[PDB]
Amino acid sequence: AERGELDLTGAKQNTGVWLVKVPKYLSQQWAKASGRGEVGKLRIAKTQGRTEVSFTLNEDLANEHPFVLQSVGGQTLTVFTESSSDKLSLEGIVVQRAECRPAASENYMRLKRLQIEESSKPVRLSQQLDKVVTTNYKPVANHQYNIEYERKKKEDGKRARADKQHVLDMLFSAFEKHQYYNLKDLVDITKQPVVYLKEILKEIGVQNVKGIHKNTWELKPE
Amino acid sequence: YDEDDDEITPDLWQEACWIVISSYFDEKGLVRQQLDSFDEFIQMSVQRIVEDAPPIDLQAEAQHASGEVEEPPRYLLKFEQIYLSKPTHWERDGAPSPMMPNEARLRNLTYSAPLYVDITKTVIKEGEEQLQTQHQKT
Amino acid sequence: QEKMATNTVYVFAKKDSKYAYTGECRSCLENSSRPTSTIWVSMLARGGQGAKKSAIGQRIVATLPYIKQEVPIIIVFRALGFVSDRDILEHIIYDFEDPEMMEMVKPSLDEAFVIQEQNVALNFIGSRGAKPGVTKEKRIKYAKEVLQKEMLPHVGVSDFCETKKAYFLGYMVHRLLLAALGRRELDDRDHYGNKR
Amino acid sequence: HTTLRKVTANTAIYYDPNPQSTVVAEDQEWVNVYYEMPDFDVARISPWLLRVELDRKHMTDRKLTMEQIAEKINAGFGDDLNCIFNDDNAEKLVLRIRIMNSDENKMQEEEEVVDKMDDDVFLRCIESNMLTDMTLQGIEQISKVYMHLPQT
Amino acid sequence: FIKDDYGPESRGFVENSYLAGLTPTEFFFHAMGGREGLIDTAVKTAETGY
Amino acid sequence: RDGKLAKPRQLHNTLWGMVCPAETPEGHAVGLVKNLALMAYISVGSQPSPILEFLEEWSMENLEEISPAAIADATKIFVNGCWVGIHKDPEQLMNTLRKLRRQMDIIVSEVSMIRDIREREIRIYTDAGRICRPLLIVEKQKLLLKKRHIDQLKEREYNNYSWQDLVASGVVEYIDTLEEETVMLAMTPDDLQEKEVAYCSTYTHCEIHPSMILGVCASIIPFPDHNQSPRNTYQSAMGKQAMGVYITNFHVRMDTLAHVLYYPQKPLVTTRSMEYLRFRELPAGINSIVAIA
Amino acid sequence: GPSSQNVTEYVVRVPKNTTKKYNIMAFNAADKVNFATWNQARLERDLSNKPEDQPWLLRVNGKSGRKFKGIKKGGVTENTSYYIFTQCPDGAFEAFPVHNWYNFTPLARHRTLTAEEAEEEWERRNKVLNHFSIMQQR
């Protein structure tokens, strides 16, 4: 299945990418840009024995984040893509990991605490009650029970028995589908009193039980 | 009013530690563990447990020996926020009234309060009905 | 009521002939359904099959919660899926600059050698656990859900955190090995710091 | 009652088919010393070597001599266990152990009724049991647990 | 106290007399010396009765 | 039950500041049913989730993203016994978390944090049922609580103030028995100041007072430090037997059985701990003129 | 140059028009992976004994390459989000969301031990008595 084939073009080109840790809040601010263009700019400052990398937010989207690089000498990381068109491709390889450190410190936290309020807050117990009794708003004729009676209130409690021969026709038809049947299936199928149907099954058949009183009746095929 | 600059005399004697101590017992008290554990048990523990993992669903055993159509009737139950009244007593008349811990001891009652919970019924039948939802306070 | 603190690893000496040392871990999300489970990883002493290599004082095994039979710890790791010995060794001790502890585990790796596939190792634990039956495959599944859910539940109860659990087992075996070398004093049976 | 495990400072197992060019160059003087030490079945004995070093103060304290140890270990494992040892007055008191076979009958008759056990692995079992078993002077459950006392 | 401090006081020597009163650490090391005797009492009564 | 003899009956050192020295049943269950000291406290416990979040911002590395065989120097960090991650600079992080706790950004008697510098490990706990006690923090070499705070406590008699304010100042902390293993706790401001040629010099907490180590019954007795210790265990049992006025409203109470004294008196010689028992309010005995003859 | 007053700035973009999910495939450097010799590869969800929940199977060069198992990350992040940053010919940076982290590890080739013959039994008899001959008799 070609759908199961993994494209190696990227790998064979030795394409490199960066892997960066940034806060959900930074990416949420980025989400406001909605891909309209850019979210900001990245700056790289290099000196005598030091490299300073940072990101700075767009003045527009805002209407310094320093980067810390991590080691990748003890692991290999690559990027592979999963298309909506059900195709897989190794689009390229991760050459560096890093973490974005927040410039603001202790007051940020308030925002965080505000953020804490946003993640954590469905009311727990919280307001009690001063009211008490409501229950049992009197059905006098139970509301489901009323509905069941209503179902009954459409021609029930009377069966054919009475049409014997036509009922026999149903038995013959049913028996054509399978050699044996449960009594319950015949009761559903012929809509008649069970004891009368038993007298018929005594007339033209036998019974065959198994397990825990599991009984099936049959017109002795031969 | 403090500045940690003009202050030059941090010294403080036997008297002041008891002033600290007194403020401890005066704020906390002599039985807080019990009381905080029970207060946390209602305010937290009982709500978490009714939310934790008890959704129950039941699907009727219909359309036996004959079935087709579209519905083996199915029901789901969910439990929301828990409510807890102030300690109450129901007199034989049927009339509730507030219960006084002293009265509870003389008449030999159980000093307890009623617990109520939000229960929901959801009927996402196998086709036609799906938006049959009703709220209860039980 | 005073009990022993949960989700903490303890090492104890016993007078028992069969166990030289024990690493005990209790689960009990004293924040869940409050089930059970109590893992022991045991260092064996006093014995020997005979002309086997003898040496019983390295044979590290694991009791899983009321499994009818003890299991060797490397088999548990293989059941978690880490079949590479270099990886198992890394999970036990990720500081392999010390030959002595690594040599100490070496006969238990040698003892594990008989099996090197996760499925087989799961079927092995099942037979070592489950009453006799017939098919292999449910036995692997049953063994898998126990290995997943009853093995250190506090670290996770899903498939997607089977690897992390393996790390915790290894620090635990490591916690055990330190006491057997004597690099670290035994835990006290009364230290209130280890009570709730 | 002291077991050889207590008397042993350390043990090692070495690969040395040719003692006449042993990797342990300091022992090399001993190998020349033991050229006449059954000079013929050196072609037959296993190339696996066990070397033991003994603590000097502890060995002296038991007043033991090497021929006692050699005779003890020979008696325990048998003639199959071919032992040699250095002088009790060398600055590094050491004991060297090899294992000899049955010479004639071992000609790969059926499949070797040992199920092809490597001798190194077997040497550990010898090393294990040699320590745990050897009961020189005291023979049972008391050993040197001693103390000595002056009563006045 | 400091870690590993084999001095007398730091490991359970009481410098004081009951009349001058015990210092706080000495009191707790004295309360420890108090238990061994109370426990010993409760055990010996059961065993010797048997 | 019925015959066990071992070590869970003697008085472990770690009960210091936690459980009563002498105050245990004089009977069969000696040392098994214990009584909680006077100041001691207990955590109610809460979700570790916000701490895990904070740890992640502090550059904590995740287990499955790292290179295990190449980072053994790193400290391992645990939360409620669960191994969450690793960190490469535990001293600043430990310092940061402590500053955060003392800032009252995270709950104090409910996030205990302990470092074992010998094993290069950092363990954290936030579950329920840990016994902990309050202590005065001392910094560098000088006590951190000072005179303005005391002036607020005297003013508290009309001006709004609380023990909680006192904790928010970060002069006092709660410390559980596991952390108490690693602190360098000094008995009195006196010793910590006088300390010039003394052996130590790095105290990190202080006792608000030594007499808080005793239970509630151990508190009735005057000069327990002049008495042979088991004499004092015996009083803790007997105080609970003595009779006097046991609550104010007894008259409207049909308690199945009760004893009240006609004339109770507060004691002439009293401990300061007794003010907080209200043993002045409802005493249990009389000041006798005794002759020891 | 770099050792001087070097300053560089790049625009960073986060497009929303992307439809393909972005995933991580991680290896141990100790495994000495060599993409330069990966002529062909397959990647399929593989749990045929038991789509989105499934682990991966990575198959390189088929019968003449190595095979790996891909395992899902131990959980979503709870504060930060890992992003992939790529360089674009125009001179900007381009950032991409991570949908998931999968870990890939060594499977072996045609070795086939199979402890079903009688090796569980042989183990009962085993005294570390044999090792080579049993692997051969299969």
mmCIF file of C-alpha atoms in Angstrom, chain A:
data_model
loop_
_atom_site.group_PDB
_atom_site.id
_atom_site.type_symbol
_atom_site.label_atom_id
_atom_site.label_comp_id
_atom_site.label_asym_id
_atom_site.label_seq_id
_atom_site.Cartn_x
_atom_site.Cartn_y
_atom_site.Cartn_z
ATOM 1 C CA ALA A 1 0.000 0.000 0.000
ATOM 2 C CA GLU A 2 1.668 3.179 -1.295
ATOM 3 C CA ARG A 3 -0.100 5.071 1.506
ATOM 4 C CA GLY A 4 2.327 3.230 3.799
ATOM 5 C CA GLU A 5 5.405 4.538 1.999
ATOM 6 C CA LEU A 6 7.619 7.060 3.798
ATOM 7 C CA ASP A 7 9.155 9.836 1.688
ATOM 8 C CA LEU A 8 12.886 10.270 2.328
ATOM 9 C CA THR A 9 13.554 13.384 0.156
ATOM 10 C CA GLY A 10 13.952 15.585 3.247
ATOM 11 C CA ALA A 11 16.282 13.100 4.930
ATOM 12 C CA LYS A 12 18.279 12.718 1.700
ATOM 13 C CA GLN A 13 18.535 16.526 1.440
ATOM 14 C CA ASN A 14 19.741 16.714 5.072
ATOM 15 C CA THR A 15 17.126 19.394 5.825
ATOM 16 C CA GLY A 16 17.558 20.872 9.298
ATOM 17 C CA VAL A 17 14.975 22.413 11.630
ATOM 18 C CA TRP A 18 14.965 23.929 15.131
ATOM 19 C CA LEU A 19 13.069 22.688 18.218
ATOM 20 C CA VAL A 20 11.963 25.417 20.650
ATOM 21 C CA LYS A 21 10.186 25.339 24.019
ATOM 22 C CA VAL A 22 7.769 28.257 24.414
ATOM 23 C CA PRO A 23 4.892 28.889 26.908
ATOM 24 C CA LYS A 24 1.252 28.190 25.958
ATOM 25 C CA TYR A 25 0.611 31.854 26.787
ATOM 26 C CA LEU A 26 3.185 33.027 24.255
ATOM 27 C CA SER A 27 1.604 30.813 21.578
ATOM 28 C CA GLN A 28 -1.860 32.043 22.595
ATOM 29 C CA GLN A 29 -0.717 35.611 21.953
ATOM 30 C CA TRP A 30 0.627 34.259 18.648
ATOM 31 C CA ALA A 31 -2.776 32.702 17.899
ATOM 32 C CA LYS A 32 -4.268 36.208 17.671
ATOM 33 C CA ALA A 33 -2.180 36.787 14.534
ATOM 34 C CA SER A 34 -4.104 33.815 13.082
ATOM 35 C CA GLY A 35 -1.388 33.206 10.477
ATOM 36 C CA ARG A 36 -2.007 36.591 8.833
ATOM 37 C CA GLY A 37 1.757 36.993 8.445
ATOM 38 C CA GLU A 38 4.245 36.980 11.305
ATOM 39 C CA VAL A 39 4.062 36.923 15.103
ATOM 40 C CA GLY A 40 7.347 38.745 15.551
ATOM 41 C CA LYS A 41 11.091 38.513 14.948
ATOM 42 C CA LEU A 42 14.060 36.519 16.262
ATOM 43 C CA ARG A 43 17.377 38.224 17.051
ATOM 44 C CA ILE A 44 20.860 36.710 17.355
ATOM 45 C CA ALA A 45 23.665 38.585 19.137
ATOM 46 C CA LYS A 46 27.190 37.111 19.088
ATOM 47 C CA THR A 47 30.241 38.262 21.093
ATOM 48 C CA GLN A 48 33.812 37.252 22.068
ATOM 49 C CA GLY A 49 32.835 34.005 23.797
ATOM 50 C CA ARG A 50 29.081 34.227 24.069
ATOM 51 C CA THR A 51 26.009 34.018 21.883
ATOM 52 C CA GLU A 52 22.797 35.742 22.826
ATOM 53 C CA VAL A 53 19.663 34.648 21.078
ATOM 54 C CA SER A 54 16.313 36.241 21.708
ATOM 55 C CA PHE A 55 12.870 36.708 20.259
ATOM 56 C CA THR A 56 11.038 40.004 20.282
ATOM 57 C CA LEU A 57 7.307 40.371 19.870
ATOM 58 C CA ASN A 58 5.665 42.315 17.031
ATOM 59 C CA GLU A 59 4.668 45.793 18.103
ATOM 60 C CA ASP A 60 1.424 45.234 16.261
ATOM 61 C CA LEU A 61 0.587 41.848 17.801
ATOM 62 C CA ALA A 62 1.525 43.362 21.170
ATOM 63 C CA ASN A 63 -1.222 45.948 20.625
ATOM 64 C CA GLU A 64 12.565 40.216 24.953
ATOM 65 C CA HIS A 65 12.359 36.448 25.187
ATOM 66 C CA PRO A 66 15.829 34.951 25.657
ATOM 67 C CA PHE A 67 16.559 31.482 24.211
ATOM 68 C CA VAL A 68 18.480 28.766 26.110
ATOM 69 C CA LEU A 69 20.083 26.074 23.937
ATOM 70 C CA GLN A 70 20.057 22.431 25.022
ATOM 71 C CA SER A 71 22.304 19.501 24.145
ATOM 72 C CA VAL A 72 21.391 17.056 21.382
ATOM 73 C CA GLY A 73 24.567 14.978 21.282
ATOM 74 C CA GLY A 74 23.040 12.015 23.083
ATOM 75 C CA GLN A 75 19.929 11.661 20.933
ATOM 76 C CA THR A 76 18.844 11.977 17.311
ATOM 77 C CA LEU A 77 15.666 13.867 16.466
ATOM 78 C CA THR A 78 13.883 14.163 13.130
ATOM 79 C CA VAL A 79 10.627 15.619 11.838
ATOM 80 C CA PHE A 80 8.184 13.556 9.821
ATOM 81 C CA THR A 81 4.888 14.778 8.465
ATOM 82 C CA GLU A 82 1.393 13.370 8.334
ATOM 83 C CA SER A 83 -0.762 14.740 5.559
ATOM 84 C CA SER A 84 -4.536 15.028 5.379
ATOM 85 C CA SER A 85 -4.133 13.327 1.988
ATOM 86 C CA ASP A 86 -2.921 10.198 3.832
ATOM 87 C CA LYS A 87 0.729 10.523 2.791
ATOM 88 C CA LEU A 88 3.758 10.399 5.061
ATOM 89 C CA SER A 89 6.983 12.304 4.477
ATOM 90 C CA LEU A 90 10.139 12.956 6.445
ATOM 91 C CA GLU A 91 10.131 16.711 5.847
ATOM 92 C CA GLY A 92 13.381 17.234 7.761
ATOM 93 C CA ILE A 93 15.730 16.782 10.730
ATOM 94 C CA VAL A 94 15.901 18.438 14.190
ATOM 95 C CA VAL A 95 19.421 19.856 14.621
ATOM 96 C CA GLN A 96 18.952 21.863 17.836
ATOM 97 C CA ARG A 97 16.777 22.044 20.969
ATOM 98 C CA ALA A 98 16.105 25.145 23.078
ATOM 99 C CA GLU A 99 13.941 26.719 25.810
ATOM 100 C CA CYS A 100 12.329 30.169 25.911
ATOM 101 C CA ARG A 101 12.898 31.935 29.229
ATOM 102 C CA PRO A 102 10.508 34.660 30.348
ATOM 103 C CA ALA A 103 11.874 38.200 30.735
ATOM 104 C CA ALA A 104 9.251 39.246 33.248
ATOM 105 C CA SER A 105 9.642 37.511 36.584
ATOM 106 C CA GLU A 106 7.549 37.959 39.684
ATOM 107 C CA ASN A 107 4.792 39.994 38.128
ATOM 108 C CA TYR A 108 4.232 37.644 35.192
ATOM 109 C CA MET A 109 3.258 35.382 38.093
ATOM 110 C CA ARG A 110 0.148 37.444 38.758
ATOM 111 C CA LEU A 111 -0.779 36.801 35.118
ATOM 112 C CA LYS A 112 0.107 33.160 35.848
ATOM 113 C CA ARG A 113 -2.067 33.357 38.990
ATOM 114 C CA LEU A 114 -4.764 34.877 36.727
ATOM 115 C CA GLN A 115 -3.939 31.965 34.356
ATOM 116 C CA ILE A 116 -4.230 29.634 37.384
ATOM 117 C CA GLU A 117 -7.707 31.096 37.893
ATOM 118 C CA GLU A 118 -8.461 30.302 34.234
ATOM 119 C CA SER A 119 -7.351 26.624 34.344
ATOM 120 C CA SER A 120 -8.559 25.575 37.790
ATOM 121 C CA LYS A 121 -11.948 27.093 38.556
ATOM 122 C CA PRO A 122 -15.143 25.064 38.615
ATOM 123 C CA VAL A 123 -16.960 25.891 41.886
ATOM 124 C CA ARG A 124 -16.350 23.226 44.516
ATOM 125 C CA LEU A 125 -19.265 22.825 46.898
ATOM 126 C CA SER A 126 -19.034 26.577 47.306
ATOM 127 C CA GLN A 127 -22.531 28.172 47.910
ATOM 128 C CA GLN A 128 -24.508 25.544 49.897
ATOM 129 C CA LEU A 129 -28.302 25.896 50.047
ATOM 130 C CA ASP A 130 -30.836 27.733 52.219
ATOM 131 C CA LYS A 131 -33.861 26.211 50.478
ATOM 132 C CA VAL A 132 -34.919 22.619 51.152
ATOM 133 C CA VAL A 133 -38.144 20.923 49.983
ATOM 134 C CA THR A 134 -39.224 20.630 46.336
ATOM 135 C CA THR A 135 -39.339 16.937 45.499
ATOM 136 C CA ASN A 136 -42.258 14.664 44.691
ATOM 137 C CA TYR A 137 -44.238 17.239 42.673
ATOM 138 C CA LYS A 138 -47.161 14.828 42.796
ATOM 139 C CA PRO A 139 -47.819 12.634 39.753
ATOM 140 C CA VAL A 140 -50.971 10.964 41.270
ATOM 141 C CA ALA A 141 -50.717 8.882 38.063
ATOM 142 C CA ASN A 142 -46.993 8.300 37.458
ATOM 143 C CA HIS A 143 -45.844 10.102 34.306
ATOM 144 C CA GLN A 144 -44.041 7.174 32.667
ATOM 145 C CA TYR A 145 -46.874 4.912 33.858
ATOM 146 C CA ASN A 146 -49.297 7.230 32.070
ATOM 147 C CA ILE A 147 -47.280 6.849 28.852
ATOM 148 C CA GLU A 148 -47.239 3.040 29.162
ATOM 149 C CA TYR A 149 -51.011 2.992 29.711
ATOM 150 C CA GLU A 150 -51.278 5.245 26.654
ATOM 151 C CA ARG A 151 -49.333 2.689 24.593
ATOM 152 C CA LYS A 152 -51.770 0.046 26.012
ATOM 153 C CA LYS A 153 -54.593 2.518 25.003
ATOM 154 C CA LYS A 154 -53.868 1.487 21.445
ATOM 155 C CA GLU A 155 -55.571 -1.801 20.830
ATOM 156 C CA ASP A 156 -53.964 -4.268 23.190
ATOM 157 C CA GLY A 157 -54.965 -7.151 25.442
ATOM 158 C CA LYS A 158 -56.778 -9.138 22.767
ATOM 159 C CA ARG A 159 -55.317 -11.915 20.621
ATOM 160 C CA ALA A 160 -56.144 -14.234 17.700
ATOM 161 C CA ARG A 161 -56.822 -17.841 18.664
ATOM 162 C CA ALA A 162 -59.412 -17.866 16.755
ATOM 163 C CA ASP A 163 -57.953 -17.756 13.219
ATOM 164 C CA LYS A 164 -56.327 -21.066 14.149
ATOM 165 C CA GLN A 165 -55.712 -22.053 10.515
ATOM 166 C CA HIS A 166 -54.264 -18.615 9.649
ATOM 167 C CA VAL A 167 -52.186 -18.940 12.826
ATOM 168 C CA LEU A 168 -51.161 -22.396 11.609
ATOM 169 C CA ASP A 169 -50.021 -20.632 8.414
ATOM 170 C CA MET A 170 -47.695 -18.455 10.521
ATOM 171 C CA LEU A 171 -46.319 -21.557 12.210
ATOM 172 C CA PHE A 172 -45.698 -23.260 8.894
ATOM 173 C CA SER A 173 -44.081 -20.087 7.548
ATOM 174 C CA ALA A 174 -41.865 -19.698 10.618
ATOM 175 C CA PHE A 175 -40.839 -23.371 10.639
ATOM 176 C CA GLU A 176 -39.714 -22.881 7.024
ATOM 177 C CA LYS A 177 -37.054 -20.412 8.223
ATOM 178 C CA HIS A 178 -35.500 -22.727 10.853
ATOM 179 C CA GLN A 179 -35.889 -26.227 12.323
ATOM 180 C CA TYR A 180 -36.356 -25.090 15.938
ATOM 181 C CA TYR A 181 -37.509 -21.981 17.820
ATOM 182 C CA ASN A 182 -37.799 -20.680 21.376
ATOM 183 C CA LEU A 183 -41.328 -20.373 22.809
ATOM 184 C CA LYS A 184 -40.723 -16.635 23.279
ATOM 185 C CA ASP A 185 -40.058 -16.147 19.545
ATOM 186 C CA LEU A 186 -43.348 -17.865 18.699
ATOM 187 C CA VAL A 187 -45.205 -15.685 21.178
ATOM 188 C CA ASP A 188 -43.805 -12.568 19.491
ATOM 189 C CA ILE A 189 -44.528 -14.055 16.041
ATOM 190 C CA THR A 190 -48.144 -15.168 16.486
ATOM 191 C CA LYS A 191 -49.550 -12.764 19.056
ATOM 192 C CA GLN A 192 -51.707 -15.407 20.779
ATOM 193 C CA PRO A 193 -52.103 -16.935 24.281
ATOM 194 C CA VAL A 194 -49.196 -19.230 25.163
ATOM 195 C CA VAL A 195 -51.259 -22.136 26.556
ATOM 196 C CA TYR A 196 -53.231 -22.393 23.276
ATOM 197 C CA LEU A 197 -50.046 -22.367 21.212
ATOM 198 C CA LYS A 198 -48.723 -25.097 23.539
ATOM 199 C CA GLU A 199 -51.784 -27.223 22.676
ATOM 200 C CA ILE A 200 -50.929 -26.693 19.044
ATOM 201 C CA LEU A 201 -47.272 -27.601 19.581
ATOM 202 C CA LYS A 202 -48.517 -30.776 21.303
ATOM 203 C CA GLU A 203 -50.654 -31.387 18.200
ATOM 204 C CA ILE A 204 -48.063 -31.076 15.442
ATOM 205 C CA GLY A 205 -44.736 -31.164 17.255
ATOM 206 C CA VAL A 206 -42.450 -32.039 20.140
ATOM 207 C CA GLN A 207 -40.093 -30.141 22.420
ATOM 208 C CA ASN A 208 -36.374 -30.246 23.009
ATOM 209 C CA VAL A 209 -34.763 -28.643 25.995
ATOM 210 C CA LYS A 210 -31.153 -27.956 26.877
ATOM 211 C CA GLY A 211 -29.069 -26.262 29.569
ATOM 212 C CA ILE A 212 -31.021 -24.199 32.112
ATOM 213 C CA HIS A 213 -34.639 -24.832 30.966
ATOM 214 C CA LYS A 214 -33.775 -23.469 27.494
ATOM 215 C CA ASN A 215 -36.501 -25.049 25.363
ATOM 216 C CA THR A 216 -37.015 -25.128 21.594
ATOM 217 C CA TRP A 217 -39.955 -26.684 19.747
ATOM 218 C CA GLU A 218 -39.969 -28.474 16.381
ATOM 219 C CA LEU A 219 -42.520 -30.077 14.034
ATOM 220 C CA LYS A 220 -40.378 -33.235 13.722
ATOM 221 C CA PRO A 221 -38.731 -32.742 10.292
ATOM 222 C CA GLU A 222 -38.238 -35.976 8.327
#
